[PDB]
Amino acid sequence: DVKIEKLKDNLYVYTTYNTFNGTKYAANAVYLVTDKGVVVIDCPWGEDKFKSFTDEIYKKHGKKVIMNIATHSHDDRAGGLEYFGKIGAKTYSTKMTDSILAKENKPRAQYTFDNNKSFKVGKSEFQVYYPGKGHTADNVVVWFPKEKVLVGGCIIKSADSKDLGYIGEAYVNDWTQSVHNIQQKFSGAQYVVAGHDDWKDQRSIQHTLDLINEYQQKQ
Ligand SMILES: C[C@H](CS)C(=O)N1CCC[C@@H]1C(=O)O
Ligand code: NA
Ligand SMILES: [Zn+2]
Ligand SMILES: [Zn+2]
Ligand SMILES: [Zn+2]
């Protein structure tokens, strides 16, 4: 199942679901429809959902995916690099993410960049920004200036998150500064999209900071 909702103009938020030990988690990402084709950020959470996802893209827009950008090495972000490459899309990731994928023997992106990069596709513009370590050492966010949408990915927890989620590769002591960096640089954001679960509640950044503090206080 893939849920797709228009967020602003040609920018859409898509959500897929993956159940872990009785807890049904949602993974949120976005895709942009341009005159040159569709740009997909991250990927459906689960390989058995890739075809269903692009099938929905065709049903709704009758267009082709020409680019895929992974915001970190995990399955819900970089899991589709092989698939999107196979169907003709130009794939990207940061060099740090590439190093992690290589180490884990996971498919890698065709092109890599040094943490930050500004993109221009058709008449659309967006930028990938590295705020520092948090959920992982390589996590990046994507900013769409025209739509005023900040795709936070997993460094941003949903306002209803019970805990920080998977922290086996996290840097909790650096996470607060990284989130403060995002907040300061994209202060005028109309929409901030958390990587998991409910993203609509815009207190997501506040709750994230709350969860980090809670974790640290408990030592
Ligand atoms: C929970 C994260 C996504 S934030 C996840 O999918 N992981 C963490 C380690 C195993 C799996 C993966 O990406 O390989
Ligand atoms: Na590899
Ligand atoms: Zn992750
Ligand atoms: Zn995630
Ligand atoms: Zn809170």
Side-chain angles (χ1 to χ4, degrees):
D1 175 60
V2 190
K3 183 173 66 172
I4 299 176
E5 310 196 318
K6 177 188 299 181
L7 183 46
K8 180 59 64 291
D9 297 305
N10 296 302
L11 184 61
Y12 299 73
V13 177
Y14 72 93
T15 304
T16 56
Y17 308 86
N18 203 337
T19 303
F20 286 76
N21 311 305
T23 295
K24 185 178 178 181
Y25 281 116
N28 311 301
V30 301
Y31 69 75
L32 174 72
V33 183
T34 76
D35 47 64
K36 296 293 181 181
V38 179
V39 175
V40 174
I41 301 300
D42 298 324
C43 63
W45 203 1
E47 57 190 303
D48 60 307
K49 305 176 183 301
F50 299 149
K51 191 57 179 176
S52 178
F53 174 61
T54 53
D55 275 356
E56 196 65 20
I57 294 297
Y58 182 75
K59 289 166 60 184
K60 297 177 61 67
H61 312 291
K63 290 183 173 60
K64 308 177 178 183
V65 173
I66 59 173
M67 181 179 288
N68 182 221
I69 301 173
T71 58
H72 76 270
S73 83
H74 296 159
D75 291 351
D76 59 337
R77 310 297 147 184
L81 289 173
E82 182 179 66
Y83 176 80
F84 285 118
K86 178 177 63 63
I87 62 170
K90 296 188 65 179
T91 62
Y92 298 77
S93 84
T94 62
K95 296 183 180 303
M96 198 190 308
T97 292
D98 183 63
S99 180
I100 295 173
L101 291 172
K103 171 62 176 174
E104 298 302 300
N105 296 302
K106 291 182 175 182
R108 300 153 68 182
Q110 302 167 327
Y111 301 98
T112 60
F113 57 88
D114 177 37
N115 290 323
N116 301 290
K117 181 178 171 65
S118 291
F119 292 74
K120 176 57 179 299
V121 181
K123 301 182 296 68
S124 293
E125 303 178 300
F126 58 91
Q127 76 179 77
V128 172
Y129 168 67
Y130 178 62
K133 307 186 183 68
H135 165 71
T136 55
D138 64 322
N139 56 202
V140 295
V141 299
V142 191
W143 172 240
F144 293 78
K146 185 182 180 181
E147 299 67 30
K148 294 181 298 181
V149 174
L150 187 288
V151 184
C154 309
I155 191 171
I156 302 299
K157 307 300 303 184
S158 62
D160 80 303
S161 291
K162 181 182 184 60
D163 53 44
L164 288 172
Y166 173 60
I167 53 176
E169 296 159 40
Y171 283 74
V172 180
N173 300 322
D174 300 279
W175 206 326
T176 294
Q177 177 72 71
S178 299
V179 170
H180 285 168
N181 290 343
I182 293 171
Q183 176 174 270
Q184 190 288 322
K185 188 174 181 63
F186 308 111
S187 188
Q190 179 173 59
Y191 295 115
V192 171
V193 185
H196 291 286
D197 299 327
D198 179 56
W199 68 268
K200 293 177 179 178
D201 190 320
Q202 296 298 288
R203 293 176 300 185
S204 49
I205 286 178
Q206 178 182 181
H207 183 58
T208 297
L209 296 168
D210 290 337
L211 291 176
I212 294 165
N213 181 56
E214 292 177 53
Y215 184 100
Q216 295 183 304
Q217 296 187 301
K218 301 178 182 177
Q219 269 73 63

